[PDB]
Every structure is written in structure tokens, then in C-alpha cells.
Design an enzyme around this catalytic site. Structure first.
Site, short mmCIF file in Angstrom:
data_model
loop_
_atom_site.label_atom_id
_atom_site.label_comp_id
_atom_site.label_asym_id
_atom_site.label_seq_id
_atom_site.Cartn_x
_atom_site.Cartn_y
_atom_site.Cartn_z
N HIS A 154 0.81 -1.22 0.00
CA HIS A 154 0.00 0.00 0.00
C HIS A 154 0.84 1.27 0.00
O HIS A 154 0.28 2.36 -0.14
CB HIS A 154 -1.03 0.01 1.16
CG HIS A 154 -0.47 0.14 2.56
ND1 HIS A 154 0.24 1.24 2.99
CD2 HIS A 154 -0.61 -0.65 3.65
CE1 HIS A 154 0.54 1.10 4.27
NE2 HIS A 154 0.03 -0.04 4.69
N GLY B 32 3.23 6.11 10.00
CA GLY B 32 4.58 5.82 9.58
C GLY B 32 5.17 4.53 10.11
O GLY B 32 6.34 4.24 9.81
N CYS C 85 4.09 1.43 9.43
CA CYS C 85 3.98 0.31 8.49
C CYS C 85 5.35 -0.16 8.01
O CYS C 85 6.27 0.63 7.84
CB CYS C 85 3.08 0.70 7.32
SG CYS C 85 1.37 0.71 7.87
O1 FHR Z 1 2.02 3.39 8.50
C1 FHR Z 1 0.93 3.69 8.14
C2 FHR Z 1 -0.36 3.23 8.82
C3 FHR Z 1 -0.20 2.55 10.19
C4 FHR Z 1 -1.61 2.87 10.90
C5 FHR Z 1 -1.83 4.16 10.89
C6 FHR Z 1 -2.18 4.67 12.47
N1 FHR Z 1 -2.00 3.67 13.29
C7 FHR Z 1 -1.62 2.39 12.42
O2 FHR Z 1 -1.39 1.29 12.83
N2 FHR Z 1 -1.12 2.35 7.93
C8 FHR Z 1 -2.28 3.05 7.41
O3 FHR Z 1 -2.48 4.17 7.72
C9 FHR Z 1 -3.21 2.32 6.44
C10 FHR Z 1 -2.85 2.81 5.07
C11 FHR Z 1 -3.40 1.98 3.88
C12 FHR Z 1 -4.02 2.97 2.91
C13 FHR Z 1 -4.37 2.29 1.58
C14 FHR Z 1 -5.08 0.93 1.70
C15 FHR Z 1 -4.98 0.15 3.02
C16 FHR Z 1 -4.44 0.92 4.24
N3 FHR Z 1 -4.62 2.60 6.71
C17 FHR Z 1 -5.17 2.12 7.97
O4 FHR Z 1 -4.51 1.52 8.74
C18 FHR Z 1 -6.65 2.28 8.27
C19 FHR Z 1 -7.63 2.52 7.33
C20 FHR Z 1 -8.82 2.51 8.01
C21 FHR Z 1 -10.30 2.74 7.53
C22 FHR Z 1 -11.41 2.64 8.53
C23 FHR Z 1 -11.13 2.35 9.94
C24 FHR Z 1 -9.71 2.13 10.39
C25 FHR Z 1 -8.56 2.22 9.34
N4 FHR Z 1 -7.21 2.07 9.50
#
Ligand code: FHR
Ligand code: FHR
EC number: 3.4.19.12
Lengths: 302, 302
Positions: free
Chosen positions: A39, A141, A143
Site C-alpha cells: 500500500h 509511519g 507500516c
Molecule cells: O504506516 C501507516 C499506517 C499505520 C496505521 C496508521 C495509524 N496507526 C496504524 O497502525 N497504515 C495506514 O495508515 C493504512 C494505510 C493503507 C491505505 C491504503 C489501503 C490500506 C491501508 N490505513 C489504515 O490503517 C486504516 C484505514 C482505516 C479505515 C477505517 C477504519 C480504520 C482504518 N485504518
């Protein structure tokens, strides 16, 4: 009796920064390949329903900026394995440890080296929950941070972080890119199941309590596996199997308390509560120590 | 919200085995000097009231067997600084990090790299208790394991492990050999004081709870520092000073809850209990996160 992580040195030397467009996250640099969540190639207008195959075709090597500390690694090639991207680079990591990729079982624990911008920030011990989430501490950040165990001299990578869920728990993949659980890498609120308690782990931790002299909860009784599992189901505890009874065997023999005797004691803690008493300093039953974690902490495995 | 240790790589490369007679423990190998507890030179007939000066005069370099992995380091010289022995060796450690020796304050936290036979076995986060003990996880052979913080690129060593107390907590020294607390390195049951709760740390952790959306315990009230400290004394909580209120300032401003407002909320948790509710997953008030630990975990310091 503490939550103890593996020493993180071998893993720290594998973490790099991976930037693609406006997104920066962590990669795992082993030999001449950097592994990261696929992603990373998404833009904000592609979050809801990405077509990763189409999106990846639209990228070239130079859209992937990989840095190991102050060194810029040139991406030579890029491929997708399930939900992880494999960025071939022009330099093999000189600090690559002996390693393997493993897909852990629910109930099993591992250490997480939490990273931001390719730099290690902290290490802690997690369990793969029965519903295939983990109760982590991850920020934006984070991930690409990885979970691992250390077996002899071999680092067994088992988790790479991808997302957080509405309940605040966390979801990710093995290092071949397959999500743990039902989760998909698109931006939508995703349900994890009912989370149940890892019964075999609670039993291991009660054994740890006995080993450390905290034994108030022991009673005179025993129980069958069948009678126990009927109580456990009522409190959303995972069923206990014969394999679990065998896994707990050494602990049973060291304390002189048969497994089904400990189960009888756990049955009463579930029906009667703890009446304000603690066990190993905890006012709740702990389920994120495996029987091996207990043996390793109570015997000093290195 | 997890207990998080510093990554342990820099420290792992400094651990060695130190054997003297029938005793084996860990040393810290920095430049051409190995640091270890001086009680390594004791025999069983010398435990009760050792005269270390006389005992050390009786040893020669070759009574100290130092190994770094499979390499036998030859001891060139030996001296005592307070309760630590300094073994000069014929090789400087090539993996010596930028480091400093610091004597931490009660209430401050650090990471412990637990070691056996010179090999790292696990890493976890501790606090120096108000009574100068630490609630560690240490077995036989764990002496010489060190506690540390990591500041920028500098490893600040603050603790070396020497002994366990009858209550099962742990005592040791700074890296200049001065014990934390009243403890002495002879074999006798030694009292630590009443242990009090680190009020500023509980306040930091309540702020962490708010940052992570767990806010049920907030009330409408405020309090003076003086009125608060009168309640705190009754529950064996450390007094809160103006310096603490200043240390908690950034957290107060990020959440929009003034420090003396949080204190009012803590006052009620102490008088009324938690009525079976949890905070950040915990059924008890946690006091082993400093305000800096909270900021680092809630902001992602690397
Ligand atoms: O490092 C980036 C983050 C780590 C997250 C962010 C805050 N705390 C964490 O553990 N990953 C992300 O931010 C990822 C990014 C990616 C975007 C494209 C498709 C799939 C997901 N998105 C997510 O984790 C997330 C989307 C989402 C939607 C609805 C409810 C909860 C959700 N959580
Ligand atoms: O590594 C060796 C251990 C670490 C201990 C042992 C088990 N768990 C730990 O944390 N240190 C030790 O075993 C040291 C050895 C040394 C002997 C000579 C003079 C001073 C003390 N002794 C102790 O810790 C100890 C002695 C003692 C007497 C009465 C009550 C509790 C006690 N604890």
C-alpha cells in the site's frame, strides 16, 4: 514476571526507509531485496478500492526511494507478492542475519521492533490474537515494522505491520504478504471477530505464578478437559486441546500440579472472580505468555 | 499502550562472560575495560561478610576468565571502583558505542538487557522505584546485566544488576559501582523502604489514556497542589512537586486538561477506586511510564 522481548540487534540492521510519492514507511532489507507493504504505492485518491496490479504497473523503480541510514539504495526492480512489495536493490545488506519466514499460529507470541523512517524506536512483546489481530503500539509511519522470534542464531520473521482497526488493534501479513485474518488492504472499517482469550497461555501464566510463589488461587479439585471447555466457552476462552495439555506438560511436572488440576483452579477464577487479589502483580488474567515464554523466562534461555 | 524497551543492539555487542572461580556472570565490555559486580570474587565461605579489599588482593589476572562469544580476552589488570570490578583486557571492543555513565533519579525508567553467560536473553522496561529497588526479572547468573537509556546516538548506562531482595525485587549499582539505595553487597536479608507510587508517572499515564481516547475517569474538578499532596500521602503516593507539574506541561497542553485538573481526577480514583473498570487495559494505576516515555510512545521518537 515481565513481558520480555527478544534482543533486537539482528533486526535493527535490516530496517530501511521506503518512500513512494507522498508516503514514507519502513522496509526490511535482507540480502538484495527490500520488503515493504504494497500500500506504499497508493495515493489518497486510491485508498478506497485500489487495483494494485494496475497501480504497480504505473510505477517505475525511481518512484521508490529506499534509504538505509544515510545511504540511498537504488531500486533495480519491483514485484508484488500478495500484499508485500519486493524492491530489488543494487546492494546486498552486509548485516543480513540468518533468517526464515514463518507464518505463526494464533496464540503464539513474537517481538515487534517498532520503526519510523527506517529507524528503530522501541521493541515489545505481542501475541497473535485468536481473531488474528495484534494489540500493538503503532503510529502513522509505522507500516513495515516487523515482528520476529529468535531461534538459536536464526531470526524468524513472522509479521509486517499494515493497518489499524476501528477498535485500535492492528492487522498485518506474514513476510510472504498474506494477511493474518480476514483483513484486506483497502481503506474501509473492517471487523475482527470476537476476540477470545488464549486459554493455554493463561494456564502457562498461572504456572509462572506458582513457580514464583504466588499460589493463592490453587484449589483441591480436578476436572475433565470436557467439563473445563464447557466453562471456557461461556467466558469466551479458546477451547483447550489435548495438544495444549501436552504443551503444558513440563510446567505441570516442575510444579507438581497436573494440567487438569490447574484447569480446575482456572475454572473457579472465572466463576468467582479474583475478589480484589492480584496474581504476579496483575488484577486480570494474562494470556500473552506462551508456555515456551514462561519456560524461557523462568529458566533463562539465551 | 505498551511497555516499550529501547532497541538493544548497541548494548548486545558489549556483553561478555566473566568467570572467577566457581562463579560466572556478565560483564560490560567498553573500550579495553570489562565492568562487572565485584562480588564475582567471593566464595561461598566469604558471602556473609566479605572484605573485598583483602579478597581482591588475593586474586590475580588469571583468576578472571573473560570471554566475548568464542574469544577469550586476557585480563591485563584489575581494580575495584566501589562495588564494581574493572578488568583491563588486552583487546578493545570494536563494537563499543558512544556511551556515558549516568546515575538516574527515582521514578526514572530504563531498559534492562537481561543476560546469562554473556549472551542477551531478553529486553524489558523498568523503573527505579522510589525506594531504589527495581521490579526486574532476573535469575541466577544474571548479575552484570545492565540497564540503559538511548539518547540520540549515545547509550547511557545507568544500572548493573547485583542482587535480589527477600520481597523478590532487585538491587544494583550505577556503572561507577555505587548501589542505588541503602543496599550493601553481602549476603544478608536487606529491607527496602516502604515503596511509594510514582505520582508524576501515574499522571503521565492518565494523560496517555486521554490521548488514546480512554477518558471515563475525568471529572469536573480541580485541586491545589497542596490539597492533592495531602490525599497522595494517605495512599503512599510520592509527593508531587512544582517541577513535576512543569514536566507534565506539554502533555497538559496537548490534551487541554490542566495538570491540577488531572490531579483532581487522580484524587477521586484513589478515594473511590475503579469500580471494576480498566484504563488502557489495566485494572490498576500504572506508574512505570515517565512523561517522556508517554511522549515518546505517543509521538514516535527514534
Ligand atoms: O504506516 C501507516 C499506517 C499505520 C496505521 C496508521 C495509524 N496507526 C496504524 O497502525 N497504515 C495506514 O495508515 C493504512 C494505510 C493503507 C491505505 C491504503 C489501503 C490500506 C491501508 N490505513 C489504515 O490503517 C486504516 C484505514 C482505516 C479505515 C477505517 C477504519 C480504520 C482504518 N485504518
Ligand atoms: O547473578 C547472581 C545473583 C542474581 C540474584 C540471584 C537470583 N535472583 C537474583 O537477582 N546475585 C546473587 O545471587 C547475590 C550474590 C552475592 C553473594 C556475595 C555477596 C552479595 C551477593 N546474592 C543475592 O542476590 C542475595 C543474597 C541474599 C540474602 C538474604 C535474602 C535475599 C538475598 N539475595
Amino acid at each position: 514476571f515481565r513481558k520480555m522481548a527478544f534482543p533486537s540487534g539482528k533486526v535493527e540492521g535490516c530496517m530501511v526507509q521506503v518512500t513512494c510519492g507522498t508516503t514514507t514507511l519502513n522496509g526490511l532489507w535482507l540480502d538484495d531485496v527490500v520488503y515493504c507493504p504494497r500500500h506504499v504505492i497508493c495515493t489518497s485518491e486510491d485508498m478506497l478500492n485500489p487495483n494494485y496490479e494496475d497501480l504497480l504497473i504505473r510505477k517505475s523503480n525511481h518512484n521508490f526511494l529506499v534509504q538505509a541510514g544515510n545511504v540511498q539504495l537504488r531500486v533495480i526492480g519491483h514485484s508484488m507478492q500478495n500484499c508485500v512489495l519486493k524492491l530489488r536493490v543494487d546492494t546486498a545488506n552486509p548485516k543480513t542475519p540468518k533468517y526464515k519466514f514463518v507464518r505463526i499460529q494464533p496464540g503464539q507470541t513474537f517481538s515487534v521492533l517498532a520503526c519510523y523512517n527506517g529507524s528503530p524506536s522501541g521493541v515489545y512483546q505481542c501475541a497473535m490474537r485468536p481473531n488474528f489481530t495484534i494489540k500493538g503500539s503503532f503510529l502513522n509511519g509505522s507500516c513495515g515494522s516487523v515482528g520476529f522470534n529468535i531461534d538459536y542464531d536464526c531470526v524468524s520473521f513472522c509479521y509486517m505491520h499494515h493497518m489499524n482497526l476501528p477498535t485500535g488493534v492492528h492487522a498485518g501479513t506474514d513476510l510472504e504478504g498474506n494477511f493474518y485474518g480476514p483483513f484486506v488492504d483497502r481503506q474501509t472499517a473492517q471487523a475482527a471477530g470476537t476476540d477470545t482469550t488464549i486459554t493455554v497461555n493463561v494456564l502457562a501464566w498461572l504456572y509462572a505464578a506458582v513457580i514464583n510463589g504466588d499460589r493463592w488461587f490453587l484449589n483441591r479439585f480436578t476436572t475433565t478437559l470436557n467439563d473445563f471447555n464447557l466453562v471456557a466457552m461461556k467466558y469466551n476462552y479458546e477451547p483447550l486441546t489435548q495438544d495444549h495439555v501436552d504443551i503444558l506438560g513440563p510446567l505441570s511436572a516442575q510444579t507438581g500440579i497436573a494440567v487438569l488440576d490447574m484447569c480446575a483452579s482456572l475454572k473457579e477464577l472465572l466463576q468467582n472472580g479474583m475478589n480484589g487479589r492480584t496474581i504476579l502483580g496483575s488484577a486480570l488474567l494474562e494470556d500473552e505468555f506462551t508456555p515456551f515464554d514462561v519456560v524461557r523466562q523462568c529458566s533463562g534461555v539465551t
